[PDB]
Design an enzyme around this catalytic site. Sequence first.
Site, PDB file in Angstrom:
ATOM      1  N   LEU A   1       3.770  -9.975 -18.114  1.00 21.62           N
ATOM      2  CA  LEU A   1       4.009  -8.542 -18.111  1.00 21.62           C
ATOM      3  C   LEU A   1       5.299  -8.241 -17.350  1.00 21.62           C
ATOM      4  O   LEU A   1       5.926  -9.126 -16.763  1.00 21.62           O
ATOM      5  CB  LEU A   1       2.820  -7.798 -17.507  1.00 21.62           C
ATOM      6  N   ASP A   2       5.710  -6.978 -17.366  1.00 19.38           N
ATOM      7  CA  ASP A   2       6.909  -6.540 -16.669  1.00 19.38           C
ATOM      8  C   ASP A   2       6.523  -5.806 -15.387  1.00 19.38           C
ATOM      9  O   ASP A   2       5.342  -5.663 -15.054  1.00 19.38           O
ATOM     10  CB  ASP A   2       7.777  -5.667 -17.581  1.00 19.38           C
ATOM     11  N   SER A   3       7.542  -5.343 -14.660  1.00 23.09           N
ATOM     12  CA  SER A   3       7.297  -4.685 -13.381  1.00 23.09           C
ATOM     13  C   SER A   3       6.492  -3.405 -13.559  1.00 23.09           C
ATOM     14  O   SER A   3       5.570  -3.133 -12.783  1.00 23.09           O
ATOM     15  CB  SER A   3       8.621  -4.394 -12.676  1.00 23.09           C
TER      16      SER A   3
END
Lengths: 606, 156, 172, 86, 128, 173, 12, 459, 122
Positions: free
Chosen positions: D40-42
């Site tokens: 996933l991303d931030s």
Amino acid sequence: MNPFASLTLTTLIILTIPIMMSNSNIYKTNLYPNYVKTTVSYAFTLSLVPLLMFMHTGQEMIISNWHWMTLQTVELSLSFKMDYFSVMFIPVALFVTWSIMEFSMWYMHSDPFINRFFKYLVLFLITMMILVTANNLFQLFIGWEGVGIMSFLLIGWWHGRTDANTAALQAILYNRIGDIGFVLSMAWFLTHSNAWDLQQIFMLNNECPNMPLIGLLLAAAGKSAQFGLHPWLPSAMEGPTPVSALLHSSTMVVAGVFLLIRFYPLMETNKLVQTMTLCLGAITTLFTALCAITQNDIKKIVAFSTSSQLGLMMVTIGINQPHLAFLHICMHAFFKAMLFMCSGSIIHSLNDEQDIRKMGGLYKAMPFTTTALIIGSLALTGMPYLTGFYSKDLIIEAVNMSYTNAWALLMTLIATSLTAAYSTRIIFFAFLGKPRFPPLVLINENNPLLINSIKRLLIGSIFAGFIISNNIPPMTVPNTTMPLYMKMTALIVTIMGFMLALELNNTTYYLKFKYPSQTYKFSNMLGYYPSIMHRLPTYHNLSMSQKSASSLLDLIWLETILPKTTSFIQMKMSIMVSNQKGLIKLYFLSFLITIMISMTLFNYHE
Amino acid sequence: HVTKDMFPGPYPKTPEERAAAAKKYNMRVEDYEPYPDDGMGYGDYPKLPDRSQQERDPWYDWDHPDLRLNWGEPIHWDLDMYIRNRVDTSPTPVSWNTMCKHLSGFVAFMLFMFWVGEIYPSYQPVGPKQYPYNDLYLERGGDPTKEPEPVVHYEI
Amino acid sequence: AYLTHQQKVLRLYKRALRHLESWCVHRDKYRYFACLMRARFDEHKNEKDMVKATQLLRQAEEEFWYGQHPQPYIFPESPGGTSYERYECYKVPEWCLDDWHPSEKAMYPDYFAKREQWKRLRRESWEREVKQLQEETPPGGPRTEALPPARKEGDLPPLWWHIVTRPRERPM
Amino acid sequence: APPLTLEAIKDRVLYVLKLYDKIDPEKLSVNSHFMKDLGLDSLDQVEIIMAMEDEFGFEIPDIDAEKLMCPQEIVDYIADKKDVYE
Amino acid sequence: SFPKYKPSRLATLPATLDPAEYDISPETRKAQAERLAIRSRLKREYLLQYNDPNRLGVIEDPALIRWTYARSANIYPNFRPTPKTSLLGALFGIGPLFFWYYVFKTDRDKKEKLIQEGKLDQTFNISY
Amino acid sequence: DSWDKDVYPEPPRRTPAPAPQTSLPNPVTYLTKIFDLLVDRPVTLAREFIEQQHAKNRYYYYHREFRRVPDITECEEKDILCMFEAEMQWRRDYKVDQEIVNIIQERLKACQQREGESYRQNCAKELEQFTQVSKAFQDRYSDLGAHYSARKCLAKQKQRMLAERKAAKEAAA
Amino acid sequence: KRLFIIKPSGFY
Amino acid sequence: MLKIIIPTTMLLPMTWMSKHNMIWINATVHSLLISLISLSLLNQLGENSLNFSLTFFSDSLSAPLLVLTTWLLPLMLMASQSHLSKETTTRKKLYITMLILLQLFLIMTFTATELILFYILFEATLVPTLIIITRWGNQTERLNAGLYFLFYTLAGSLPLLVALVYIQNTTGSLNFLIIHYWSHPLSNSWSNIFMWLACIMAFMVKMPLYGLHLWLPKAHVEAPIAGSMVLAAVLLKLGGYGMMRITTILNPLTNYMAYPFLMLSMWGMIMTSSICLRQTDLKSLIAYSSVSHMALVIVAIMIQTPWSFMGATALMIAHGLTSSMLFCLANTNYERVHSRTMILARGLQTLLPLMATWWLMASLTNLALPPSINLIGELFIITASFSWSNITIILMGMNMMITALYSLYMLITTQRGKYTHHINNIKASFTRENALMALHILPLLLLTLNPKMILGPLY
Amino acid sequence: GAHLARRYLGDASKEPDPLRMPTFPPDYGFPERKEREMVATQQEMNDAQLMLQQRDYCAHYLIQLLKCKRDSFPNFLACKHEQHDWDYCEHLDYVKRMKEFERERRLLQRKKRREQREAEMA
């Protein structure tokens, strides 16, 4: 006269017995809360009997037994004046405290000092009863400060609660501002009237009570959370939820209002002083309700409503409706409290949460409270044939059917609409909608004490207005020939606010984006009044006490204007006296000058 | 354990003594900035930021979280009115001038609409309650000796 | 130390969405608006030269600063919450137990027995941990408040007692 | 408040993380590195941590929010937050 | 992002609208390295006594004794007869006493002027 | 009662004998009846013990008397003997005069409750009787000061008496 | 279960 | 009064040749016995002062102060037991001698017949306290404390001596009975103003008055605890007892030259109470509180009304019991924490239950809850001042509100809140200082039941 | 309301002044106007200790209200015709004031334009 007055004396001492047993350290601290239940319920039970003869023959008297001070011309003694107001308020107060601390036993049980807790409600109860059962202002002053310091301790129930300590600090502070008028009235009565007992002051015919009336008005303003003296009442909500269903719920806040109706013999004399009450009361009705309209709490909103209500009855005092105001207070004490622990029952069940934005879907899952809050929500608005009907609807007509300023009426209709609008709002967020609450479904109200405590307040909040109204003879001329609409206006102004809120609640479901409206922020900082009053004047007053005052005046100038200057003067020239090099020629030269100027020049020989 | 050098000195003038008070007061050289030398006696004490304890971050591991202070670090001369219970300097979402303008407006208007309402006293279109017996002459407190000035009204 | 560029936006994005659910109130309404702002956050995920993202910071941080709710939902245990710092009036420091009359200590015998060995455990641990911390600390003192681990043999984590003997969050 | 023990908390977070449609049930692990194990991303990390925010009720400090990587140490973090031991 | 909030003394500029938040110069971010270091040791020494079991009683708080000593002792040694200080000394000195002197003197003179010929409300006042 | 109506005039009390035409009988009547014979009865016989025990050994207490001494007007300057006697006589007269104000306030206050809502019209007699006493008190002892004395009051009495003497000649014209 | 409650020595 | 004087001086040989450990037990028990004997002095006639002897007389003003001193003496005896343990026996007996000598001079001062004899023992109290403040103090500044306290009182004392001996040559006697009985109006001649002045600043310098008070914060915050109570509880009131005495002859001057001191005081307590709210040292607040409370007394005496005099007496006794309690309370905290910084030891309710109560009504008596004698004295002042001027009400009413502001502030900043975790020496509260507070508080409520004994001879 | 508009936004002299009117002799315009008479004597109000604002002409019914009420104890659902006479008396007495209000109203209405008619004819 063998019953009644004696019975009242029995009622006010049996409530002290728990404290006497508590301080004697012979009582058992475990069942003491339940022991407190039995005392208050019994004290309520013996509180009904003093009503019976008042219904029968209406006798009223004053009990003054043990003479305290002689103070030359002004004797002082403990004295209770039992009149219409005091006599039927004791059962109303007694019934309320018995139910609210009945609820508080289940609620306020996860704390080590619940014994010390329930003792504090007892220490409030006799102080409040000292206030209402009073005959001179000093005893009322005793109760006035007693409840105020009682709120200070009760609001700061958690001594580690920083916010509660600030609220308690604001709680007494505003209450002491009110007592400034109490002291002003205290001095005037002892000087111009030379009396303290209530009876003498009224019948001395002080037809120039201008300054006392302002002093009385200021006292009630601080106690009843008027504008400028309001924000402590919302602040008191910081404490435990039962504490919010206590002194500041509907009990202590109306003490100043009780003082206002107490001095109604002289209150009506000055139309000017008669006016400024309903003004400030009207502003409280608009402003506090306005804050509660756009808000994100439960206890705070109904606290703002209480201040709006607290602005209501003494508006009627401003229009000379003393007994009608007192009826409204007891009705107000009924349903305002009634929704208080119902909100608290929700708070306890939903893991000590207060914001509305986490409520929802509780209608079916919170059955008994749902009915209770639903009735009480517009019971505050008072549908026909209810506690609120015989008080609020008559109040709106009475001010309308009288001689007031043009804006006095308009705030009253605005009050009724604005109060109802959020009165519908808190139901919508709480029970209707969807449960915006954590996944763990703990929500439950099966506690028997929970049900029974509120149960007696259903019968109170619905039946009391009817029975009391027919049990109390009218005090003023009834409003018979009336141009229709200004009575029906009170009922209708309630429903579009309910209707406007209804679609406003629906617009929350609407996926339309919402903008930070100025009104939304305006009502959310309470009109920014705590944002500046608790910030600017306090900072200036505290800051100048150090730069100036403590240092500049005292520690910089006072010790420089007398001690250090004189010390330096001796310091400076003691050197020139003592810095003698010791030359004998110089010493005897000074002798020669002293010898020469002794005569001729100074002529000490002449 | 205590000495004059770490005691608060006089008003600092030379840059070396600014550094001298910097290590004593436990900041860096650029972090030392005493009050103005107007003669108020503040002297070597630095003009720390005009902030309150409410502005302090709760999440930081304060050595005194009751008031959000840490051991050893310098504190403010005016800390006493700038602590959590007392006056707070934390920012408000509304601009301070705007909200003050809102207050100074509303309370001014509030008096204004009532003032004109006092100039426009509303009343019902009804006559006066002319009370019997000379509007209760003796009962209201009239003189028993002399007769009243009979306030006697016929019927309409 | 300094808050990194992508760290600052994460902080601002945090309460901005908490502001959003404060505004939207309803879960579905929040979900619709949260995802819309998620793509809005992703609209210029690319930044290349850091100067562009600094300007993009300014507009972004200005957005979420005005994006606050007038009365945002502060949780009961949130800083400034209803239940925040509520039970501090009940927690009492562990050393107060030593200041107990022998009657109270005797009537709680097992607890004081295990408290004694915990007091003993503090002794050697404090001894070992201080001669562990002094040389684990490089010259110039500790560059940061982070504290070195118990990486030696049979050794306890240095500066542990008040952390381990912390007043439990539910003192009751 | 009933004695909510870590076993209930541990089940709730992993169930919600499996419930999270972008962390699929089959690809969810006890030590699920959002950046590496889950990719996933931030921003999704913010969404993950603030999902259990409202789902558990208590508060996660921001300086601890970005650090908290895996559900196992999500479990341990809430474990030391209340100090559960059973 | 809107008409911006103007900072005030009793409500300062937040951690968002402050220019330094997004104007992080190399030296400004560099500054947050050594202030952290001195705080690290300052926190360390506090722990070396707070977590010290041998330590008992109360440790000295240098800042607190610095505050008390500067708030109590080092004001006069730093005091100056500066004309400004004398100016604020004058208006907060004899000023308020002359303020209340005139107010009470005027009140007493205005009050007294009607007692000697019977123009007050005193009939029910025989206590003093 | 020990006190008599000449000192404390108690207005006569009338009883509006009831007539409960309603179907339900009154609840007060037996509520006071039960309160009578479950509380009053034990304390009546207990009081009979107290009254009978007082009769078993009834000692005596008298009233302190005070033989009148020459007044400050007839007393001698710088003579500490006679004018001390007049001083103490004046102070006792002040204490009695203070209690006269107390009684008339007690009688006045008792009037207000007795007439109830009719206090405005039915308490004027007691109010004016107190009013003239208070006015006489004001020219008697008021304004003397915390260090009041017989000579100080005599100066006030002389000051008032010379002012009216001048007023009387002014009225003669 | 029962945890341990900590209080100052109220015997004195 | 030698039935009190003779046993009091007999305490000296008994305390000076007792055993090395019985000095505390012996002194405490027989001082309490003296208090019981002094309780018989509460009897007062209608207006005749009890004229026991030619050189000793008492009335309803002297006796309440007399009992206050005698009742107080065991209280510093128990308070000093804490920090006087680490001392040699001979020096310990020297400390007891100073306290007993201080008591003996106090009883003779109140029971004095003429002003000059009153003046001799009045001032004579400076010597025992000067040794107490300086020899047994705690910090370097105590040397500057003694000089500040000594010269300030003396600077005003000497003018009174010149005026007093001038009274004897003019009137012919200085006896209080003759002065009041042979009282004559004082002319407004320019000499008579200074004549009036010389008999005033002696009493108001030690009140203390606004401006002439700096010795009060520089001594009470800095004296040993035992000396701190007697300074605040009684020594300030020495001006009160004198001023009711000296005002019997200084009339009708008080009408004019009260003004420069009246609003000097009237702006005073409001100013002082503001300083109390913004202190940093604990004992500094109560010291600044004492002058604030003393300020309303100055108005009470000077206004010359019977109601104010009763209010002056009641506030005088009530403040003594209060200020002694808070000073004792601060001493209890200072001993364990070895400092007096206010926010150093905030939040101690969780560890000090009984103390938190002893904070509670001690501050409440400082707030003056009804019906504590503090208000009975305070309210009487208000009615007297209002009768003098209506515009008075706002000022001291605002003062007792800022008085309320701080009087909870140390309660919040000492008991409310969270303990300091590094502090670990707050032991179990010893019964000695604990029972000390009980003996302070119960007489306050006991006198609340029957205040009629402490309004002075004007009641 | 309507009369408020006719005075504030209209002519103040046209509408009666509540604190000053009536301004014309009631006997003028009604030759031999019978006096609104009293039913309950002074001692009736005095012995009943009625309050002054409710001591109006309707107080004769009011004492009857209390007396059935003081004898309706226990019950409170009785005492119906008593008020039916009382509020009707207050209903008609309020009409009497209303009639006096309109009397003065049309008193002011008639004379003002009658004087205006004189102002027109000169």
